[PDB]
Symmetry: C3
Subunit: 340 residues, 3 copies
Amino acid sequence: AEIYNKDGNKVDLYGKAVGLHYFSKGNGENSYGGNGDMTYACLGFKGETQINSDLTGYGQWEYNFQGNNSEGADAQTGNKTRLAFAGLKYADVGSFDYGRNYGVVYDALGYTDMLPEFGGDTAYSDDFFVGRVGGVATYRNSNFFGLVDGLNFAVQYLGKNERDTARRSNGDGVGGSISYEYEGFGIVGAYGAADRTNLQEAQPLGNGKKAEQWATGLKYDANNIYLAANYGETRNATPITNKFTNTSGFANKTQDVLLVAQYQFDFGLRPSIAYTKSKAKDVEGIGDVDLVNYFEVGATYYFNKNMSTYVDYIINQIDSDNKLGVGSDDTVAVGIVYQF
Amino acid sequence: AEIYNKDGNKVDLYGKAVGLHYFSKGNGENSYGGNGDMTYACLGFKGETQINSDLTGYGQWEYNFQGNNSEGADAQTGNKTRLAFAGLKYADVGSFDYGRNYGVVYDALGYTDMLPEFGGDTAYSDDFFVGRVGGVATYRNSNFFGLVDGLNFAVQYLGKNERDTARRSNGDGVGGSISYEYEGFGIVGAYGAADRTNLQEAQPLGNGKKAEQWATGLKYDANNIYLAANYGETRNATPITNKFTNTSGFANKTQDVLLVAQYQFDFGLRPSIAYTKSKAKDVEGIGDVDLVNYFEVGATYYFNKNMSTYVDYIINQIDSDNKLGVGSDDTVAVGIVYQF
Amino acid sequence: AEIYNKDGNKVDLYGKAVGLHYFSKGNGENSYGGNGDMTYACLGFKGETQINSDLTGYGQWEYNFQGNNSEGADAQTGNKTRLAFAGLKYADVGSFDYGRNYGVVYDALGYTDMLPEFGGDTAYSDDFFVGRVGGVATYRNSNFFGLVDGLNFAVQYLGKNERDTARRSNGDGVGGSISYEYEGFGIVGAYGAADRTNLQEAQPLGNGKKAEQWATGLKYDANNIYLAANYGETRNATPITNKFTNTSGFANKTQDVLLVAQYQFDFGLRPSIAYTKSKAKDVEGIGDVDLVNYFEVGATYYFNKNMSTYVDYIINQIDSDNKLGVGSDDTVAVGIVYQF
């Protein structure tokens, strides 16, 4: 909600309270999304100041406050800053920002990341260019310097992040994307390669000294209709765990397909139908193994722009003999969202 | 403070900075409330949107930021989300919300939870239905569907929370309350029973497979006067620790009495007089032992609706030979509160 | 940004998103400021209510959210509340506040704590009276009860803080300051002494039962010019670590000199030139050792009051044979700040 707007500076303080619950049989250990209370709340700000007609400054921070922990020792579990960056937009020359932000490949994956509660399986956090990462410098151009409406691109420099954990670490890398949007249609191609840290390489699964990720996306967004499609691949980038051996590392290779179709009724109901499949190839010891494989049926009802509720049902297609131990049970999310 | 209110959506951003200090002899280890700096600050939001004339959506999140930690490793100690839920209110049909909220028995205990700094001893957190818990679905009706002014009730479903700690865990349960308020008078009855988790049962103290809690309250609230009274009981629900053996678990049984009398002078001074006693029965090994037992004399002065100060003095009646090791020294809290 | 102002109560919600990066050779282990992403964001509030013409209440809380952590286990690293206090200002009698705030000696050190990114080396946190500490009661008088324009003083009572760490602990103490400001000129003297805790005394380095710190400052602040100077000394107060032996404690004695000169161009550019040197004396085992020693060249450009960028370059004068192991490499900070 725009809580401030004077002297060319407007601040938007936003946030949401999400009452959420997951339903899965058993202890949800073998299910797709887990089982039980998953309530949480978000709080963040979006600032934008007009330094003059062509130059705009801006900044954004967003935090995740878990609402399913006790007030005891476990109180902070799951709490984190999602975004934190600042930047400048200049006329038609483009924009540049730095800090914790979305990797460029997400410019692709963003297409299908539209399910009510699940979806966007391949958009992992602190995983190179697919989701939110720290230390990214990002340049973005819109409409090819104003010369070609609908043609956009971005380049992104990822700075090395040596964390205590191989899963949350990364070496330096570069990534870019090109997308074109013409009247309800949109197409994108995104790609990024990077160095893997010593620790990442010291992991049991996966083998290489470079990490790659590219995805393409197609979408039809108009007339209350939303059909989007994604296909991407990766090398030594996708994090995987062998639940049996308790071994971890990255998939040597994965081929990812995400499909989504939705419709927005004028009365507030937005039904959703999706399909996701991500399969690892050449996993040391296992061979080819599905990481994600399901159908999704769900719906969101919007009371207005501030209130809504939804049910997200995952019809898991992963089978019980999945070599890595990926769960095979279904998961049903019900939630009630307030937001400003 | 209502920082936003447009298009039927109003957001209230609130918070307080509390300079606080406890005075107790010794290392406050044997005193009632501890000794030293207890400064803290709170920040939260309360949103409410009018979906139309009969339907209202809403949400609330509230966080506790300890202000007595260093900027070192201990910086996060005591930090937590107190509330986090969303819900809908429909005409005279009632309201329903879900997320982290107050257990139904607190509908009773809330009566005497009015001391300047202490009080509400029996309203523990993550303790079934007495204080704030996670995963509660709560339905509340006011004025019996609009048919009977002053008659209100609530039912509440508690979802199982299996935490690493027996103290912060719980099984599924149900609770409800009925209260009636007629011209300054108010009466309530609250009750809830629930399953105890494996771990809770694996504890040394307490013995059962179900946890119960009920409290009743009477109050006179009018003409600058506030006299409230509470009496409740519990079975295998109250958490207790034997400081000697370092053993823990829950009291098999407790009988709780809380008394409060206060007066609001027109010039801002609100003196307070209270009495609290909670006694455990059949504690394995000890027998009958007082958990809480004191008198309270204190005062709050309100400069205005945003500023105030207070002194809360606990005249501890617990004696030095208390079998569990509950402290016997007095505690005096002084604080200065700014709030918006 | 003043987001609220009604009925004599105004709240100012402020914050900033800082994209920041450090450049140092090697693993920045031997450099002055480290190497890599140092992005972060701040959020805090400042409230002030007019209880009447002479009496003002107020409160302030400020939090630091690190933006260079992953969304994993390390997510909370570096997060902390910087300030948290409440107080009252009465006519010309002065003000008094309590909670986490700035120690009185900082009334001196504040003079030179003006570098774009570095500087204020001696203003440590949770280090008695030099930086932010918890549990400080502070009385401040301005203009000597209104009788002498420009004459100000403060007294401060520090309450004992026994933390798990000797570095973050403190015993009771008292401190005061006197400063005088006449037309662009300002002079200050600050001093404080305190008890050292058992644990602090149990440390290998440093020897005493009392901790002292005093600093004086001179400054010329006018006509776009800023020249400030600080000289202070300490006894058993400055925390020091022997990187070789991995030993820690406090310097028996230190002599600190901080120098700063800056100029604000009308077009937004504020160049900066500074010099800092802090040298420990009588360090058990080493003798005299420099703790900090460098020159600083840097610049800040202000697009407007909400946006800016800067480069801070540290020309480290510490030499590679520094007995304690203090790093000798240079560090260059580049950052882009959005703030409201």
